[PDB]
Design a binder for these strands. Structure first.
Ligand SMILES: [Mn+2]
Ligand SMILES: [Mn+2]
Ligand SMILES: [Zn+2]
Ligand SMILES: [Zn+2]
Ligand SMILES: [Zn+2]
Ligand SMILES: [Zn+2]
Lengths: 162, 162
DNA sequence: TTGACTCTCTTAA
DNA sequence: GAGAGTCA
DNA sequence: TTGACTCTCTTAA
DNA sequence: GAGAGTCA
């Protein structure tokens, strides 16, 4: 199996290639009416993507390296966490974008957590609006807000109490 | 069926049958350190469930009525909203539990909204913890909290800026 | 060893 | 969160 | 007409 | 949010 040193070499190669990706400025809500700025290192929209990178789905990519004539492949966003536990509380760990920008591969924009924690950041009020995430959000979630509920609770008779 | 009066009669029949379901008291967090009480009308765990009701999945049921010698069937929680639009902003409308208790069919615990709004209620701080839902939550979401993130944003080198 | 494609899968509302 | 089919 | 089962599907992380 | 196959 790959040694820790070999894993670090994979991570170092990933960082060097991704650091050459275009760095794009995005102005984002932070919560409480405050705005901030994030810098995403964005993979190209079409091939070529960069040494070792290939698109396996509309917004899914993989990283590949050959070591001692054996081919190894990882999800493109999982590489910063190859030295971390792969599960927590009986749930699998996922790469999670604090920036909600799939093409972005900035490791300063990624955390390693459960799919429920990952999903939940979509509705978080944000670092300046009341975020309670132990690993703090970088922005207000894209889906925070009043929502668009079509109909609320209602009864025709009087069989029910709340 | 097709007539408003037929639709009203279905809702009246559904309300009468659900009104006989056992009423279960649940003590729930509301946000802000406050606790409250909800009264859920719970479908039985096994057959028989009630006139017109049948189980199609572990926590899935359907309501069925014969009208004009024709069988009409709906998802068991959708019946209160049969007169509402079936989509919103190009998104399908779903029945959404404010009590987060699938077995509960109390119409005072249900709303009609997109699936994103539905899911997002899982993380809401609650009616006394800062809920901004236009149609207000009845309790804090079951997944609100700091989370259990295994690893946060990090870099081995010095190529990236947040 | 490498690139650019192909396919199917998981979870919990 | 959904819809539809097979029996009795 | 009614009941009790069966199977597969949708969406967006 | 994932892993794996094919071909040159
Ligand atoms: Mn995410
Ligand atoms: Mn729900
Ligand atoms: Zn980013
Ligand atoms: Zn947060
Ligand atoms: Zn309820
Ligand atoms: Zn709410």
């Amino acid at each position: 199996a790959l040694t820790n040193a070999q894993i670090l070499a994979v991570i170092d190669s990933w960082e060097e290639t991704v650091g050459q990706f275009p760095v794009i400025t995005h102005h984002v809500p932070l919560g409480g009416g405050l705005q901030g700025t994030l810098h995403c290192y964005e993979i190209p929209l079409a091939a070529p993507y960069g040494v070792g990178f290939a698109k396996n789905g509309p917004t899914r990519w993989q990283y590949k390296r050959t070591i001692n004539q054996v081919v190894h492949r990882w999800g493109s966003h999982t590489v910063p966490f190859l030295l971390e536990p792969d599960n927590i509380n009986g749930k699998t760990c996922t790469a999670s974008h604090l920036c909600h920008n799939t093409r972005c591969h900035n490791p300063l924009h990624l955390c390693w957590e459960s799919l429920d924690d990952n999903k939940g950041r979509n509705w978080c009020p944000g670092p300046n609006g009341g975020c309670v995430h132990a690993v703090v959000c970088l922005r207000q979630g894209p889906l925070y807000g009043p929502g668009a509920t079509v109909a609320g609770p209602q009864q025709r008779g009087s069989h029910f109490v709340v």
